[PDB]
Design brief:
about 25% helix, metal ion binding, seven-stranded parallel beta sheet, EC 3.4.21.64, two-stranded antiparallel ribbon, calcium, Rossmann fold, zymogen, disulfide bond
């Protein structure tokens, strides 16, 4: 399949070169997989989700996305126009308040929620979780993300927007999950992107167009926006039967565009997510 005039990040993940604007992908498009977006919530009524998104858990007075962040990320995972996996199912977990912050204990309880709730859903092609959030180092936030991965869910988490080593952040520093940096349209590391040996992959993160609350759209930047590109890709690759939840981050890194990014500090991987689709 081919989507003309796609957002630059979608076109990049199916190209060996920057500067294109068409996204190519197998038409299975993630059918039969599920992605949890653990964030500020999802505006499920957005016409871009086509009835494939819904809220399943909130820790606040409303499960509504009064912020926009959670909606933006969920659109990069699986909205018809801005999504990687255009036929996957989206499950919203609201662990951040409408100001975009949340306690660590609420974030941990959301992660344990998904590790059990996938047993209440139909996902015969596999389960992905996208965690567009983070803060300071916490061994108990790291361990919650390890448990979720171990339960059979591919976990993708943001490196962080501090322009520092991601070792001092959680759950970016958990080694068994998939830590995602951010790149821009000229194949440069985003100026805000964290780095380090803990990073596993880079995704498109600067000026990413996607859904917004009120049925709108806008373009924002962050390792929070590279993370749903990889999360959607994993759901796409598991539908095609090319990998499982336990080895999706490893598979994505093996099949990635190698040595194409600039301003990657020594000791950090130089890998850009790539769907390897031959139309």
């Amino acid at each position: 399949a081919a989507q003309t005039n796609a957002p630059w990040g979608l076109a990049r993940i199916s190209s060996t070169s920057p500067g294109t604007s068409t996204y190519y992908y197998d038409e299975s498009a993630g059918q039969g997989s599920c992605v949890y977006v653990i964030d500020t919530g999802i505006e499920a009524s957005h016409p871009e989700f086509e009835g494939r998104a819904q809220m399943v858990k909130t820790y606040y007075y409303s499960s509504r996305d009064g912020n926009g962040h959670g909606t933006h990320c969920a659109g990069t995972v699986g909205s018809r126009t801005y999504g990687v996996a255009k036929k996957t199912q989206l499950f919203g977990v609201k662990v951040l308040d409408d100001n975009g912050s949340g306690q660590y204990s609420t974030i941990i309880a959301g992660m344990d929620f998904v590790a059990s709730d996938k047993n209440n859903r139909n996902c015969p092609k596999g389960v992905v979780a996208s965690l567009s959030l983070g803060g300071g180092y916490s061994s108990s936030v790291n361990s919650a993300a390890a448990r979720l991965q171990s339960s059979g869910v591919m976990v993708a988490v943001a490196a962080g927007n501090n322009n520092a080593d991601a070792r001092n952040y959680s759950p970016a520093s958990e080694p068994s999950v998939c830590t995602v940096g951010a790149s821009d349209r000229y194949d440069r590391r985003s100026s805000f992107s964290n780095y380090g040996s803990v990073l596993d992959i880079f995704g498109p993160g600067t000026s990413i167009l996607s859904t917004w609350i009120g049925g709108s759209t806008r373009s924002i930047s962050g390792t929070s926006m590279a993370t749903p590109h990889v999360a959607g890709l994993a759901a796409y690759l598991m539908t095609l039967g090319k990998t499982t939840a336990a080895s999706a981050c490893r598979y994505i890194a093996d099949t990635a565009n190698k040595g194409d990014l600039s301003n990657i500090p020594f000791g950090t991987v130089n890998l850009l997510a790539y769907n390897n689709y031959q139309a």
